[PDB]
Amino acid sequence: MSKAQAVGSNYRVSLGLPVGAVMNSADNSGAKNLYVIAVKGIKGRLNRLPSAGVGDMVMATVKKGKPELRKKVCTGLVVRQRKHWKRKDGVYIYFEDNAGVMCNPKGEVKGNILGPVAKECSDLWPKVATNAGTIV
Amino acid sequence: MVLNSLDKMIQLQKNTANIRNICVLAHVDHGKTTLADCLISSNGIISSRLAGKLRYMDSREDEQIRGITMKSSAISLHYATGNEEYLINLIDSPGHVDFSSEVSTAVRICDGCIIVVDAVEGVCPQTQAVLRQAWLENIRPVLVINKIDRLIVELKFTPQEAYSHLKNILEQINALTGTLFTSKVLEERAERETESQVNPNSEQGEQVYDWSTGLEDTDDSHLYFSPEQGNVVFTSAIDGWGFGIEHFARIYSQKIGIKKEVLMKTLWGDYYINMKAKKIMKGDQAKGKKPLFVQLILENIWSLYDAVLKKDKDKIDKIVTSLGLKIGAREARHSDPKVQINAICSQWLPISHAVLAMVCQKLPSPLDITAERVERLMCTGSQTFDSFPPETQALKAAFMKCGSEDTAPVIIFVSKMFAVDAKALPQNKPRPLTQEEIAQRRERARQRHAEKLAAAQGQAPLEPTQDGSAIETCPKGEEPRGDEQQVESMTPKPVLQEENNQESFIAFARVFSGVARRGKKIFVLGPKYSPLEFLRRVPLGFSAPPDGLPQVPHMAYCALENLYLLMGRELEYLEEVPPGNVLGIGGLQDFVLKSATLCSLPSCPPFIPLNFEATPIVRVAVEPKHPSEMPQLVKGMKLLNQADPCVQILIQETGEHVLVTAGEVHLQRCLDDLKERFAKIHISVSEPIIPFRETITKPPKVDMVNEEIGKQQKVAVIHQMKEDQSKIPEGIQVDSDGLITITTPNKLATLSVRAMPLPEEVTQILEENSDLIRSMEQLTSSLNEGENTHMIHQKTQEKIWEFKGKLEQHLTGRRWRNIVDQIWSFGPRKCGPNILVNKSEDFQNSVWTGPADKASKEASRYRDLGNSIVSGFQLATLSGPMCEEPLMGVCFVLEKWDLSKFEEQGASDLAKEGQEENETCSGGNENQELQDGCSEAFEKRTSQKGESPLTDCYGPFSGQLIATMKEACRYALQVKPQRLMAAMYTCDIMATGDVLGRVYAVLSKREGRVLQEEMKEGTDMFIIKAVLPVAESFGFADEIRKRTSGLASPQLVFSHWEIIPSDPFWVPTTEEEYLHFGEKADSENQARKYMNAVRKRKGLYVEEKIVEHAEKQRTLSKNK
Amino acid sequence: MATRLQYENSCDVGVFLKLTNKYCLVGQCGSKQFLHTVENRLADHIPVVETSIAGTRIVGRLSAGNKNGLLLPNTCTDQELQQIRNSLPDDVVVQRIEEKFSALGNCIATNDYVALVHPDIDRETEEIIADVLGVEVFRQTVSGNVLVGTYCALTNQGALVHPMTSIADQDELSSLLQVPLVAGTVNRGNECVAAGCVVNDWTAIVGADTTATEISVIESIFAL
Amino acid sequence: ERAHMRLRFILPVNEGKKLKEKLKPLIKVIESEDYGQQLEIVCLIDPGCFREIDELIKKETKGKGSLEVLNLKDVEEGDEKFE
């Protein structure tokens, strides 16, 4: 999922948004929430959660939203993190805010993205960048 | 012009020699599309380049994606020579594979034609196959030999070889010509090119001077060589080219004084040159010494091609320096040329001026072939012929003659129309006015969307955005347009937002009527239009209004003001209609039928009763994927019916609904169509291969059978039934096929039966379906008791009173003329390759009195029962001998029949029947009270108690009799060995001998056999005529064709059903028998693959529901 | 003529790549071949910058303008700006926009004489943008969306928009811009048309995912 | 779903008429032919799986008929045409 995009795992990182946590939709899908079942890629170990990033592609479910979406498995991409992280630049970014954005396994994101997106995510994911309302 | 406005277009159409719709038939896609698009681009119609460049060959997007051309669609094709103006109105026919109902249908809609054949892949077999059907319809097929660009430039072979190659192609074409048209002129031409200049020595003394020698007097011709009216041309276009002999000639003419007419003779054939003063002659030859194309002209085309890709420019210039091919500048700015190549070519190369002109001028007006084609399709009467001037009406006569006076209701012709929709992706919504968006849109762009009415609408606010930069400056443009800069391609909102609405159905059609006026009335009468039908037989229809003097159900008079030409997309008006162009019904698809063509006048010709089903009758079990989607599915089939011809959604022989096609390869293709579009339908399918049929070539010597080949050792056709296995009720020393006579209602309906082999020729004759119940009886067509009954007799030996029969009669003498006023059904639907005939004696009102048959002579006064026999036979035939699917090549003869009993006690079986009837049981006035039941005899003409002694309708009622009949025949033929008549066709494959061995290897695996492998000296192809079952090919010919085109070109042609020694039957009975071993038959087998579960296409029943009163031998008291 | 190019084997050639009437920008991606190709194409014509915009691979969707001015948000460093300036001719104004409220390029489609703005960008910011280019600015969305330059492939010779655009807006958009708007897509029905194909008047670039017909259609639109 | 069949009967002369008077509007009854000398024939409409309801009324009114025809629950003996 794709997997051919765009590019790499995208350099330094800090996970934090783990399994269980609910994060905002930041999208014009009828969902408001994205609950994370699990995160792609994270192989893990004994009683460690597959923790999400700010780009790391995520399995999800709309815990509350449009009841044509409600229940089921969903997917998306994580877009901002409640907790901070150091960058390639040697600089920390911070939101108290946290959010994802609903998407298909294809790589395609449906429509527009409301509020500030991570730069890293944009770099990784071209579709996100394309319909980005703001990129920091 | 380049756009071609509506008004102008209509005017042009109205002018003479501006129609003849050509098809463009070839493989599915060999580069056909490519060939098409370039031509379109070259032509000046709807923005030039926007018309061409991968737009119009495969009509739908889905089709394009597939690489599978299916539907037909109409576009406009307009070229401007300078003074003259030609028009085709091009129907892009699919060019689909063999055994297809899309291609044939297409070919007869279009008034013209054009043959695209390959010079590196040979002549296309598919094209040939369909064309042979199209020779029975009036068309103008112009020959254009394609893909010499492959031979001469791309693969790069010398022009000496080209000539050699061409001869083979020509020969092939000759063969094609010779199927139904004449083929001697061609030969003559080959022998000596053109009419004039007969001696080669004389060409030295005529070409040194500048004269127009080598004449042909132009002359009219289909595809016959008079070098195609002196305008013969190779069509070829892969990067903007055209070529053509004519073009070559022209080039030559400019170099040296010898004129264009001189080179029409020489460049077509294989001529040579001295090169003293370009003295062209047949001589000056050793082994192809000094040809014209190798020295000049076709040498430079290579040079040109190389030049344009790399962009040297000097090379290009040389070519130009002959006359003017354009050097090329300001369209290769950043290198990497693509359009540049096209541009240089499209000036002086293309052959639009030669072919279109040819199409046009051969028939000087549009009134020729439109008037002629009525007897070739179908007339108003079958025998009286009232579409012609007989049955005097002024309008009708006029529109037969074609052109009309200056008014017409317009009778369309529609065998196949463009995609049915509920949105319309390839058609604009008629939002501006009732119709027209070709010039109207342009006007709108000019006037409305300019600043003066854009500003008013809201350009200064921009949907009131107050306190911003919208109202700061208050913008108003200066004619914001895309008109007269990119040849009127872009307007403000060119392609509309496709809305959901009633008016979404699309059509192009073909018009029989000439000129019409806007405000066109059309009549919607009954389900077949009765007045039309009345004019068949003696003329009982009139020119008066429907449902007055001529009777007809429903009756309604509608006003259709939505008809258009269809330029792929866009709508157009038409009240200047020439007879032959495209002009179909617009938004409405309700006021029309396929059973009879559109009613508009009271007296019309119904051009099409029905199109084309397969010869084996290939079916498939179409099912709902979801139960809630069933209704949608049902709807969808109907929708498909209009777009893709022929499906059994209503009127069923097997199941609720089944999809049908013209062949095995096409069945699969049509199931793709029943997923996309329509009512958003989705299906699940159950194909236990295509069904075959059985034959009974061996009865027993047990009970009443006179003619037989049974003995006391040969039980089956091969080995015995004991050695094969199963079906052993009695011993092998009196044949194990016995118990063929039975008794049912205690000797009130005793019968025996005889199933012998029907002659193959006879079967073939009958399979054409000219033993029709609609011809002999009813008011559908033909006289019921006049001259038409003799015809029936001629093919099938049946009469008012028969005592010789069928099998005895046609052996000694066939083609008798006698009346027929009694039938026992001609098959499972009173038609097909089967027959029942009764030579039984009159016992007491027996074997006569069918449905609507009264002679009043034999059977006392045609009294009581006899209809039962007529009825049950059909039922028997529809089902197989072992309760599956139909059986063919069988001659049923009823040896004896008795209606009365002289036992006078009753039976258990009888008693039940009596009870059911609601009448006391008897066979000779044994009782009083209850003289009414529910038997048909009573209904028809009372009992037979008072009329004559011995009443024998009391007890066995008609329904039960019918049931018995159905049972009994089946029973008789089940115990007999039933040999598999497999539906096979010979595969006329055309390949090279090197890979045909390998190709044949795989053919062998599909139960195929070679009849003849031979070599065709004359053509480049090598031929096997090996048989191939219809069932075991299910996209077989489609795979090998694409995998290897040219080295495996299977031409599919039917012949007849080969019979093989195998007996398909359900359940293997007794393994002891098998252990003796003489093959495995009457069991699960290779033969049962074809007869596994083809019964259920949803089916008549769950498996088989039947009741019988032949059981219990003691109560009936029978020895049978 | 039109060429079907990739980037990181993707269909998107308006995220990594930027292309207008003049000045081509590409971010230093891991793949060099794809960078080279563009340069080769635009030899002694348009100079490629080979500079990661905002220190990042994103370029086409983080920049706006054509060849009167050229726009960049506040995210970019001074150093980044300087490099960009150096790369291109020093006739055009390359200038940083203060008070970031959006990612530019997704909200600023533009022509040589006007511009299509977000809208919802602040007034002062808008004014700055107007100044930098010289051209006008017109507050209008695209029906459904708020991101224009993503869902409107805007150039002088032609303008591509997805089918979801309404009838009236399109009609009045065209009027406003003095160039017609055509309904259509790229990359087998991809919603983001402008990332799919970047348009210069002389040569038109597009992804590999388009069909033979789609490409033809686009060619016809932009007068090539 | 499903189709009905003809469970046929033969009523008396006197009671048949009475039966007809009640059974005409209540349920579907076909092939009715009243006579003085030749009795009355009727055909009560059921699929076999609702043959208790049609007969109960008859039982209440007049008892059993002269003959009571029962047919199979798969086909009606003479091909179904109902629903």
Side-chain angles (χ1 to χ4, degrees), chain B residues 514-543:
Chain B
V515 177
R517 302 183 294 170
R518 185 51 45 179
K520 301 174 190 178
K521 295 285 177 294
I522 49 168
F523 308 165
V524 187
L525 314 179
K528 194 59 168 78
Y529 313 122
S530 302
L532 282 61
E533 297 298 338
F534 288 160
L535 296 159
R536 299 183 187 169
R537 320 185 300 283
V538 302
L540 299 168
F542 300 87
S543 185

Side-chain angles (χ1 to χ4, degrees), chain A:
Chain A
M1 303 175 180
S2 342
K3 221 181 198 179
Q5 285 187 291
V7 58
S9 291
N10 205 294
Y11 297 87
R12 299 128 176 289
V13 279
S14 300
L15 307 171
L17 199 76
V19 310
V22 191
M23 49 159 190
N24 306 159
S25 180
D27 188 32
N28 301 342
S29 69
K32 292 154 277 288
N33 290 337
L34 290 168
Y35 183 101
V36 202
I37 290 169
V39 178
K40 301 187 60 46
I42 303 288
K43 307 159 185 195
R45 69 164 301 168
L46 186 44
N47 305 116
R48 178 175 324 220
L49 309 178
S51 297
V54 283
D56 276 2
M57 189 141 166
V58 293
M59 310 311 278
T61 184
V62 173
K63 190 62 171 171
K64 295 167 53 276
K66 197 176 80 198
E68 304 188 39
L69 302 171
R70 191 158 186 167
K71 312 187 82 68
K72 321 185 206 301
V73 174
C74 286
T75 50
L77 289 176
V78 62
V79 87
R80 325 150 190 172
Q81 203 151 219
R82 72 201 159 187
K83 306 189 191 170
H84 63 261
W85 71 98
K86 193 166 207 171
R87 288 202 292 185
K88 199 83 180 153
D89 290 314
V91 183
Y92 283 97
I93 305 305
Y94 173 49
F95 300 76
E96 271 193 317
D97 334 299
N98 35 303
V101 67
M102 183 82 192
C103 88
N104 288 343
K106 295 172 199 301
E108 316 207 64
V109 177
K110 66 208 78 191
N112 304 338
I113 318 169
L114 327 178
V117 182
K119 184 62 68 185
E120 320 324 300
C121 206
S122 310
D123 286 341
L124 185 46
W125 300 107
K127 308 319 298 177
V128 167
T130 314
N131 308 316
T134 307
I135 310 182
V136 186

Side-chain angles (χ1 to χ4, degrees), chain B residues 500-739:
Chain B
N500 293 352
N501 188 35
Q502 290 179 126
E503 296 188 292
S504 59
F505 315 117
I506 328 169
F508 55 87
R510 172 261 195 175
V511 300
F512 187 63
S513 303
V515 177
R517 302 183 294 170
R518 185 51 45 179
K520 301 174 190 178
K521 295 285 177 294
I522 49 168
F523 308 165
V524 187
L525 314 179
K528 194 59 168 78
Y529 313 122
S530 302
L532 282 61
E533 297 298 338
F534 288 160
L535 296 159
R536 299 183 187 169
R537 320 185 300 283
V538 302
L540 299 168
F542 300 87
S543 185
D547 197 33
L549 298 173
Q551 192 181 130
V552 65
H554 179 58
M555 187 269 291
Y557 305 126
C558 297
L560 186 65
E561 62 146 44
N562 277 120
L563 297 88
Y564 50 85
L565 196 81
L566 188 62
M567 305 206 194
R569 298 188 298 118
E570 313 139 293
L571 289 93
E572 299 84 46
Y573 269 103
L574 249 169
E575 62 260 300
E576 297 192 311
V577 179
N581 80 313
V582 299
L583 177 57
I585 65 187
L588 281 285
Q589 213 190 43
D590 294 302
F591 311 130
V592 289
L593 289 164
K594 208 186 79 177
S595 300
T597 57
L598 175 55
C599 184
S600 74
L601 291 305
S603 296
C604 300
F607 301 111
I608 39 158
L610 192 63
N611 283 282
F612 290 90
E613 292 180 59
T615 319
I617 315 180
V618 305
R619 288 156 285 201
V620 65
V622 178
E623 301 178 306
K625 191 176 71 59
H626 214 89
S628 309
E629 208 169 38
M630 180 184 179
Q632 293 179 52
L633 174 53
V634 168
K635 193 64 174 284
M637 290 213 73
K638 296 185 196 302
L639 299 181
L640 182 68
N641 210 64
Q642 293 270 22
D644 173 69
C646 308
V647 288
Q648 277 202 300
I649 183 54
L650 299 171
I651 311 304
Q652 304 293 124
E653 77 207 62
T654 311
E656 184 190 328
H657 52 75
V658 298
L659 192 142
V660 289
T661 53
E664 70 288 351
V665 302
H666 190 37
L667 193 60
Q668 184 166 198
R669 301 265 86 95
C670 289
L671 289 160
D672 286 298
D673 280 26
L674 199 51
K675 298 173 180 65
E676 66 183 300
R677 313 198 183 184
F678 304 116
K680 304 181 182 177
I681 82 299
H682 301 289
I683 56 166
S684 297
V685 292
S686 183
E687 199 81 278
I689 60 175
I690 296 161
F692 291 175
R693 42 274 303 178
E694 288 69 57
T695 308
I696 308 302
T697 64
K698 184 161 192 313
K701 66 188 289 299
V702 188
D703 318 308
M704 296 165 174
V705 55
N706 296 288
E707 182 154 310
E708 46 66 61
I709 62 171
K711 311 189 182 63
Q712 55 165 22
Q713 54 185 239
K714 291 295 298 189
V715 178
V717 175
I718 49 159
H719 322 297
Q720 309 187 16
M721 196 76 75
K722 194 75 177 178
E723 296 178 37
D724 276 53
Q725 86 180 119
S726 308
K727 303 185 179 174
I728 304 292
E730 67 190 59
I732 54 157
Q733 305 293 72
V734 74
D735 309 321
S736 308
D737 348 310
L739 309 176

Side-chain angles (χ1 to χ4, degrees), chain B residues 274 337 677 896 915 991:
Chain B
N274 292 249
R677 313 198 183 184
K896 198 73 179 62
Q915 213 188 251

Side-chain angles (χ1 to χ4, degrees), chain B residues 215-244:
Chain B
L215 301 169
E216 37 283 288
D217 207 70
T218 311
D219 83 81
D220 300 327
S221 58
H222 286 222
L223 72 164
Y224 321 141
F225 308 142
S226 298
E228 321 219 52
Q229 317 213 14
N231 314 323
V232 62
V233 280
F234 312 123
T235 299
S236 275
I238 59 172
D239 57 275
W241 287 319
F243 304 144

Side-chain angles (χ1 to χ4, degrees), chain C residues 39-223:
Chain C
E39 196 192 43
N40 293 358
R41 197 164 296 96
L42 310 176
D44 297 287
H45 272 297
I46 296 162
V48 302
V49 309
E50 290 159 284
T51 321
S52 293
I53 303 307
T56 49
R57 304 271 189 256
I58 188 176
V59 175
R61 314 284 64 157
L62 204 79
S63 293
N66 312 300
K67 64 175 176 63
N68 330 358
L70 219 71
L71 298 163
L72 303 169
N74 196 241
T75 313
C76 310
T77 61
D78 195 290
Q79 184 196 338
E80 187 71 74
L81 181 68
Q82 191 63 211
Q83 286 171 103
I84 295 154
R85 182 49 160 267
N86 286 314
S87 307
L88 305 177
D90 320 299
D91 307 82
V92 69
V93 184
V94 190
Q95 173 60 252
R96 283 206 292 163
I97 310 311
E98 291 193 324
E99 292 191 77
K100 56 170 293 312
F101 211 80
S102 276
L104 313 189
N106 298 339
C107 313
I108 313 290
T110 172
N111 253 339
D112 282 293
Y113 51 114
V114 299
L116 183 55
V117 93
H118 183 30
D120 288 322
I121 194 74
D122 298 302
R123 189 66 267 276
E124 309 322 309
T125 314
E126 195 174 298
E127 286 173 83
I128 308 322
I129 291 161
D131 187 29
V132 167
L133 294 174
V135 304
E136 297 193 303
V137 290
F138 285 120
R139 294 198 175 192
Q140 209 179 348
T141 63
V142 63
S143 293
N145 315 124
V146 295
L147 307 182
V148 277
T150 302
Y151 294 99
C152 287
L154 193 58
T155 54
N156 300 290
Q157 302 293 308
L160 183 64
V161 302
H162 61 155
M164 296 147 64
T165 314
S166 195
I167 301 158
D169 205 277
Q170 195 164 338
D171 284 330
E172 77 185 79
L173 271 169
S174 308
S175 310
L176 185 278
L177 296 163
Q178 312 172 58
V179 61
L181 279 70
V182 189
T185 58
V186 281
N187 306 276
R188 282 156 190 166
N190 197 72
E191 73 215 51
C192 312
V193 302
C197 53
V198 286
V199 190
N200 167 37
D201 289 9
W202 320 316
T203 307
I205 309 299
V206 63
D209 218 64
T210 47
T211 46
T213 65
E214 275 190 310
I215 61 173
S216 306
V217 168
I218 64 169
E219 205 167 302
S220 64
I221 294 159
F222 309 122

Side-chain angles (χ1 to χ4, degrees), chain B residues 465-503:
Chain B
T465 307
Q466 303 290 310
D467 287 327
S469 297
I471 64 160
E472 192 188 312
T473 57
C474 192
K476 299 187 189 177
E478 297 201 34
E479 299 197 69
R481 296 177 284 163
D483 308 301
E484 311 168 64
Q485 59 178 24
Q486 303 180 26
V487 294
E488 297 179 281
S489 182
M490 297 195 296
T491 53
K493 194 76 175 187
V495 180
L496 304 177
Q497 183 174 286
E498 308 301 346
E499 294 188 317
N500 293 352
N501 188 35
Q502 290 179 126
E503 296 188 292

